[PDB]
Design a protein around this ligand. Structure first.
Ligand SMILES: [Mg+2]
Ligand SMILES: [Mg+2]
Ligand SMILES: [Mg+2]
Ligand SMILES: [Mg+2]
Ligand SMILES: [Mg+2]
Ligand SMILES: [Mg+2]
Ligand SMILES: [Mg+2]
Ligand SMILES: [Mg+2]
Ligand SMILES: [Mg+2]
Ligand SMILES: [Mg+2]
Ligand SMILES: [Mg+2]
Lengths: 159, 59, 50, 50, 173, 186, 191, 51
RNA sequence: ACUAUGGUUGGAGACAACAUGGGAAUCCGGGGUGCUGUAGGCU
RNA sequence: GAGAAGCUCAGACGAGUAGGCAGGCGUGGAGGUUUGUGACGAAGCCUUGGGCGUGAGCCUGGGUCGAACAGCCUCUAGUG
RNA sequence: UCUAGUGGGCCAUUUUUGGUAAGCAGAACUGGCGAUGCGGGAUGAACCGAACGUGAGGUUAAGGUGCCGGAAUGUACGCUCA
RNA sequence: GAGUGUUUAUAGCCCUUGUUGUAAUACGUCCACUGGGGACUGAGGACUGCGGCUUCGUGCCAAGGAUGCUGACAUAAUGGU
């Protein structure tokens, strides 16, 4: 009871979203991909050509090659006791840029914007992110906000 | 009875010598690239090396 | 080293007194002083290795 | 420099608590056990273990 | 050893409501950690708040104002049995609300095999008038001319000669 | 109990030569002292290589020494070349330049040709006297992976390594699995 | 006790459940009458078979009719046998109902005068069912969703339109003109 | 060097080697030398005794 | 509602409660009923 | 000096079948060495005595006995 | 880099499928036994606790403290007669 | 001698506020505050260190690990088998 055809068990994985069938938005074809870009793989069931295998659906990797209609994407997959370099040729309908990559780009930009300004003002810059610190001391007032005393409620059937 | 598959110890075995990651190199083989890109890159790189050689020598 | 130790002692005692004074002030006014959350925790392992 | 200072300190090798633990160690402190966060009661436990 | 605490807490302020309301409970717990945990247990079933999205702003132990005055304590509880949920009312004579509450927990353990987790204390009130006492076994203790013999204990022999294995004579009541 | 996982527990290196050569023991004695009583990485390098096996101490020829010390941007003009190993001759180098070399062993032909060209040959103890910390020295090694076994290591499908075969020619592993006309290629 | 296994194209060869009638009494009643509802709820997760339900409904119909008649009750069976229990023949064997905790098994709305009678009939059916069940009195009007106090106010304002057994409850949604005409006595107050 | 660990909390000479400040350390300072007011408040006490 | 984690917890079991955490759907109610780029026309 | 194959200071750690490696113990025979042991008692054997080693094993008192035998560095195997 | 053993597993928790059920068969996750002694569960491969060099002292876990048996015929409030 | 029916009488109780208050006490927490009883251990072996105290000196100390003072036995005792 187990077939190993390419698209076995992809019944929901390769479905277009509800009320998202039909036309493919043409901005997908106008995106530019360069070697070193970090892309997400997300299979469009409406484009049967250039389909990556279902293992790569929802995976993120680096573009190593650019062709007319496709990109080569480097993906590491565990195959035992080690990761293996996989090179998947994907048509650009199944690919999108990682949104964190622009977030990392902008954070670095803001880091150097802070660093240069801190240098000129002759002060520290403190470019390190920090985990959410313990909450600080405050002074909750009760004027016009008097405490309400609660009690546990008695049991009663609501059917 | 044969056909006795189980994955119970297999994950433990994989982690004994860990999930190894492949070595990352500065340069990857251009045999994975488009052949037209690869052919022209040979000429571009050859000219860059020639130009770097001349400028050092003529300095 | 002795001078540094003395200043640390004064610092610990000063922080402790301010906590008492802030709590007393809040009780007097009927408001609430929410103290600073701890920055330090000590962790003890209570289970063996099985 | 907490990170460098704390890491420099070898993990403390405490004894078993003088006076023992609560009846069942391995339920939560809120449930009358010993596991998990116990707030300032970590100090009484350390006295027995130090 | 239970203690009574007042606990005051609130939802952490957000942009939608920057002045969340303050809610107070009186809770019987062995320590402050359990008191705060019980506060969030009871607040979660009334308000859309968790410990992660709330904060405790005050906690104070409440001592008994008149620990030397014998009182009558009426306690309303809600408890889970093996088959269902019930509300019941019990009355206890004590000098502290803590003492009555400890009496109630022992009483529910003995008579219904009800554990601590299965009991919610709805209210603890000091009953002032004689007729408001609903149990006769309690209001008979409010008689000025109340008299009874000493209850049957296993006698008493100091602390040391009670450790003696052999006695020269049989005991006499 | 303690939960310690131990991977790099025992050091994997030699702490002494496997050789029983008494004179090698004397050289180790000299360089144990020098590597301990100086701050020189050169002396620790010599001590470590004095322990190594024959396969880990490949030879180097005087041609390679002459080439390595005569690069266009070298400045390795009048400096002593040092190898913990054998210095062989390269008869293809018809004219040997003037070289200063310190080595464990010199081949008879290598030693004769170095001297005849006005150069000098030193043992490692003579080197220790001249440059006790290896200053202004070219420390060199032979090619570790030039030996035959490295033609074969890693043989496998599409690895382009050499097979172990008793004989070479057609009929000796050039058929099914080695060409497209016979099932598949490698 | 596997995952639900109903009749389907993959399970065409199925027996019919032994109960086919789920509605009894004055099924075509109204909203003014039968104002009090009693429910028999399942207290545990049981697997009441169609035989056990069929037995209960026959017993409930006979006792209730003899004691109060036909016009004073609206007995209905909430549980439906849709799970198929298999067997090896001497393959599907029977139909059972998977009821969770607090699932109503039989609901009867009667007069408040028949409050004691409705309790007793619903009490007897516990001997036919497996597991444990409890008798509770609904806080809702008959088979509606509203409390008796609220339903009275909706009835006194004039926003309730009787439609067979059930009814139509006004809402602040849809074209006004249809809402106006349909509710004659109701006051569409202008705020 | 260091053949036997000595607890500074028990060995006073070792406690002097570490912590030079221990000699001058003054515990049990009296700060309640004044009139000692009471800080409870009317609102606090009426909230405290509710129910 | 569901759920990760916990107990020599309850219960014959079915399940349930509690403890340290995560946290819906649906219905119902209020509000809304296109925004925008390029290039050029227009009392 | 401290068999530099030596000397010295410190810290952590310790289950193990199948299996792997290292360092040792014991046996027959070979080269070398030890002004080696021995009819004034070799080897072997017995022991209700002693000593050494974590152990494989080793040394020794007493008894019996009668012709050979051992230590150290190496070689070797029909070696427990 | 070279090479050994192995290629019959089994138990528990939790998620399950088949089966009337099973000390049943088959899969998922983790911990175990196999290769794990020790304290506890009278007993016991797998449950609880805890994983082990030879020892001195101290303190504990799980579990106990009428006697067998080391340790309160301890304290407090009830319930229960079989 | 049993029942009433009025708020200190010839008693008492409950609930509010003033001081003599910096009341005590309990509990919690801390003291580089302090006083005793019991047991196991004594690794190391010239010196060197960090401290303290000093009459400032190759001095003293509880400060990089036990010494001191006594007694009895010695075909006993302790060890071994
Ligand atoms: Mg004790
Ligand atoms: Mg315990
Ligand atoms: Mg669970
Ligand atoms: Mg457990
Ligand atoms: Mg071992
Ligand atoms: Mg032989
Ligand atoms: Mg003899
Ligand atoms: Mg014998
Ligand atoms: Mg020994
Ligand atoms: Mg043999
Ligand atoms: Mg005993």
């Amino acid at each position: 009871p187990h077939s190993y055809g390419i698209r076995a068990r992809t019944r929901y994985t390769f479905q277009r979203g509800f009320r998202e069938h039909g036309q493919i938005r043409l901005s997908t074809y106008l995106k530019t991909y360069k070697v070193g870009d970090i892309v997400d793989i997300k299979v469009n069931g409406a484009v049967q050509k250039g389909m990556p295998h279902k293992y790569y659906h929802g995976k993120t990797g680096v573009v190593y090659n650019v062709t007319q209609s496709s990109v080569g994407v480097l993906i590491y997959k565990v195959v035992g006791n080690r990761y293996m370099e996989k090179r998947v040729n994907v048509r650009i309908e199944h690919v999108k840029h990682s949104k964190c990559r622009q977030d990392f780009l902008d954070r670095v930009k803001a880091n150097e914007a802070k660093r240069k300004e801190a240098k000129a003002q002759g002060k520290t810059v403190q470019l390190r992110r920090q985990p959410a610190p313990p909450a600080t001391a405050h002074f909750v007032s009760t004027e016009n906000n008097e405490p309400v005393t609660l009690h546990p409620v008695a049991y009663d059937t609501t059917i | 009875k044969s056909k006795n598959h189980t994955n119970h110890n297999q994950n433990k075995k994989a982690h004994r010598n860990g999930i190894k990651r492949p070595q990352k190199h500065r340069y990857d083989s251009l045999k994975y690239r488009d052949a037209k890109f690869r052919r022209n890159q040979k000429f571009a790189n050859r000219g860059t090396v020639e130009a770097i050689r001349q400028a050092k020598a003529s300095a | 080293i002795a001078k540094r130790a003395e200043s640390y002692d004064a610092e610990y005692r000063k922080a402790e007194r301010e906590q008492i004074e802030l709590g007393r002030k809040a009780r007097a006014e009927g408001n609430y002083y929410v103290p600073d959350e701890t920055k330090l925790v000590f962790v003890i392992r209570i289970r063996g290795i099985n | 420099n907490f990170k460098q200072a704390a890491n420099f300190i070898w993990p403390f090798q405490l004894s078993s608590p003088l006076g023992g633990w609560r009846d069942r160690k391995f339920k939560h402190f809120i449930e009358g056990g010993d596991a998990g966060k116990r707030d300032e009661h970590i100090n009484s436990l350390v006295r027995k273990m130090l | 050893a239970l203690k009574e605490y007042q606990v005051v807490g609130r939802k952490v302020p957000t942009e939608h409501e920057p002045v969340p309301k303050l809610f107070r409970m009186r809770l019987f717990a062995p320590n402050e950690s359990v008191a705060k945990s019980r506060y969030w247990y009871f607040l979660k079933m009334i308000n859309k708040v968790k410990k992660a999205t709330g904060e405790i702003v005050a906690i104070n132990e409440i001592s008994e104002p008149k620990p030397l005055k014998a009182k009558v304590f009426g306690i309303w509880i809600r408890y889970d049995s093996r088959s269902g949920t019930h509300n019941m009312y019990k009355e206890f004579r004590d000098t502290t609300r803590v003492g009555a509450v400890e009496a109630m927990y022992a009483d529910m353990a003995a008579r219904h095999r009800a554990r601590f987790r299965s009991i919610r204390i709805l209210k603890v009130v000091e009953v002032e008038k004689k007729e408001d006492v609903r149990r006769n076994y309690v209001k008979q203790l409010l008689n000025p001319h109340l008299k009874f013999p000493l209850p049957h204990r296993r006698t008493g022999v100091v602390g040391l000669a009670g450790k003696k294995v052999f006695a020269p004579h049989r005991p006499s009541t | 109990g303690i939960d310690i996982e131990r991977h790099h527990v025992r050091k994997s290196q030699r702490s002494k030569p496997a050789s029983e050569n008494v004179y090698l023991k004397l050289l180790v004695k000299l360089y144990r002292f020098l590597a301990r009583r100086t701050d020189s990485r050169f002396n620790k390098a010599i001590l470590k290589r004095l322990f190594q096996s024959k396969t880990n101490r490949p030879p180097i020829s005087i041609s390679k020494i002459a080439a390595l010390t005569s690069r266009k941007s070298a400045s390795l003009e009048g400096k002593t070349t040092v190898i913990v190993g054998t210095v062989t001759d390269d008869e293809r180098l018809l004219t040997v330049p003037k070289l200063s070399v310190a080595a464990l062993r010199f081949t008879k032909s290598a030693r004769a040709r170095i001297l005849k060209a006005g150069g000098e040959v030193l043992t490692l103890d003579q080197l220790a006297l001249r440059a006790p910390t290896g200053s202004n020295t070219v420390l060199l090694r032979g090619k570790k992976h030039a030996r035959e076994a490295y033609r074969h290591f890693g043989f496998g499908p599409h690895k382009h390594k050499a097979p172990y075969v008793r004989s070479e020619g057609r009929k000796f592993e050039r058929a099914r699995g080695r060409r497209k006309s016979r099932a598949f290629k490698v | 006790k596997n995952k639900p296994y109903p009749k389907s194209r993959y399970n065409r060869a199925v027996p019919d459940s032994k109960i086919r009638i789920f509605d009894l009494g004055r099924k075509r009643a109204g909203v003014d009458e039968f104002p009090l509802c009693i429910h028999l709820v399942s207290n545990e997760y049981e697997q009441i078979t169609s035989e056990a339900l069929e037995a209960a409904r026959i017993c409930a119909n006979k006792y209730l009719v003899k004691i109060g008649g036909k016009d004073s009750f609206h007995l209905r069976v909430r549980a439906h046998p849709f799970h198929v229990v298999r067997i090896n023949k001497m393959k599907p064997n029977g139909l059972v109902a998977r009821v969770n905790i607090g699932q109503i098994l039989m609901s009867v709305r009667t007069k408040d005068s028949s409050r004691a009678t409705a309790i007793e009939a619903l009490r007897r059916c516990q001997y036919k069912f497996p597991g444990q069940q409890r008798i509770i009195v609904s806080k809702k009007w008959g088979f509606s969703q509203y409390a008796r106090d609220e339903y009275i106010e909706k009835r006194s304002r004039g926003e309730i339109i009787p439609d067979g057994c059930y009814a139509k409850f006004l809402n602040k949604r849809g074209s006004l003109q249809e809402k106006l005409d349909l509710f004659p006595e109701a006051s569409f107050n202008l705020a | 060097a260091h053949v036997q660990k000595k607890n500074p909390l028990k060995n006073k000479a070792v406690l002097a080697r570490l912590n030079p400040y221990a000699k001058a350390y003054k515990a049990n300072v009296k700060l309640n030398t004044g009139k000692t007011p009471k800080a409870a408040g009317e609102k606090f006490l009426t909230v405290l005794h509710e129910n």
